[PDB]
């Protein structure tokens, strides 16, 4: 029944956003629902959640990954708030430092 709940929620989100983003994001979100079709949303653990994020990262660009993560988190929180599921897997995930430095400015050298 997650597909129906996610499908209903996705339609409301499409209220204000790029159509291409919704179609592309829906494809990634829909793929996760079909993949976890035998695995209930309330049975999803933090480990599997990270696996999904890394799975789409190798299939989608970083910009698209952010939208999928937010949509997935918003959909998960929506079902939890409706007391339809008894779980909230997502918190406890952090990665301090260990990040690649950004050169931001392309000038680099200066005088």
From TrEMBL:
<feature type="domain" description="Core-binding (CB)">
    <location>
        <begin position="1"/>
        <end position="80"/>
    </location>
</feature>
<comment type="similarity">
    <text>Belongs to the 'phage' integrase family.</text>
</comment>
<protein>
    <submittedName>
        <fullName>Int protein</fullName>
    </submittedName>
</protein>
